[PDB]
Amino acid sequence: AQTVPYGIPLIKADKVQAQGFKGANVKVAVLDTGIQASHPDLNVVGGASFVAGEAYNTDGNGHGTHVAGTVAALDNTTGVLGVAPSVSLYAVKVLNSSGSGSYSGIVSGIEWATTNGMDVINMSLGGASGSTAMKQAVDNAYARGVVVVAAAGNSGNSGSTNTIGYPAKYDSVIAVGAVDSNSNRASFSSVGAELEVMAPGAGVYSTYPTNTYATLNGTXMASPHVAGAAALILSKHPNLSASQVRNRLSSTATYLGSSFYYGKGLINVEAAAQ
């Protein structure tokens, strides 16, 4: 009765989970539209909301619940299966139900996660511009040992135009692009010198508000695969620093083409967690 989304075997997360590593006791904060904590296939440990009028454990949009399920949907006999099903999941609401948020709200979410000892921060969000405060927040989180992952953007490519959004563009953040079930680059995936790795992003089935499951497209779907991957590497090698985990993901990636379009390639967690 439990469906395994194609992205799990494509990045070889199933090979690592089989070895017995599932992200147990790794703290992952999902900075998004919140998470439907009551969903039967998700276990939210805690969180915070920096959005006015909405608690952190409700998701009036669906995006956050979907992103969270890709990272951590519970390994059981129902729903879907996450990349790191045993992770301690934290919902940090920085985007409202319409899917938008302020720089200050996001920055607060990053500081909260840094302050509260998160091991991995997933940001399936981005803007055309950044800000000094946002740059300072991600650099600090990274310098403090947190693996920071963000969706590269859904602006495709305009010739040689760099379309990578913020915060993925900052060098302390891993910019994740998207591929489909055939390992081909999705048309919407942003391109640029900053693109770092690729992960499943087209046709991703995951948990969705009001106890159900849905399919969405976006680099937003790709990002959690990498945040989940970092969690598996950390559960297997708890001694690694944020830099080492990051370097393992990019160095062992499967080459797919030019770095402007694919970065270093598709992540291979089995190889990265060696």
**Omega before 209 cis (within 30°)?**
no
Contact between 173 and Na ion per CB under 5 A:
yes
Contact between 175 and Na ion per CB under 5 A:
yes
Judging by DSSP bridges, how do beta strands 204-208 and 212-216 pair with one another? Answer: antiparallel
Rank residues 2 and 115 by Cβ distance to Na ion and give the closer one. 2
Task: Count residues near Na ion (CB under 5 A).
Answer: 9
Q: How far is the CB of 168 from Na ion (least distance, A)?
A: 5
Is residue 139 annotated as involved in ligand binding? Answer: no
Residue 204 CB-density burial (10 A; 0-12 exposed, 13-18 middle, 19+ buried)? buried
Site for Na ion in 7-46 (CB under 5 A): 41
Q: What is the torsional sign of CA 115, 69, 34, 181?
A: positive
Which strand ranges, in their side-by-side order, compose the sheet holding 197-200?
44-49, 88-93, 27-32, 120-123, 147-151, 174-179, 197-200
Q: Pick from 165, 5, 11, 117: which is nearest to 70 by CA?
A: 5
Catalytic (active-site) positions:
32, 63, 220
Among 28-36, 118-126, 168-176, 210-218, which window interacts with Na ion (CB under 5 A)?
Answer: 168-176
Residue 163 CB-density burial (10 A; 0-12 exposed, 13-18 middle, 19+ buried)? middle
Q: How far is the CB of 97 from Na ion (least distance, A)?
A: 25
Among 62-70, 73-81, 154-162, 264-272, which window interacts with Na ion (CB under 5 A)?
Answer: 73-81
Rank residues 5 and 79 by Cβ distance to Na ion and give the closer one. 79
Contact between 79 and Na ion per CB under 5 A:
yes
Q: Which residues bind Na ion (CB under 5 A)?
A: 2, 41, 73-74, 76, 79, 173, 175, 194
Binding site feature residues for Ca(2+): 2, 41, 74, 76, 78, 80, 168, 170, 173
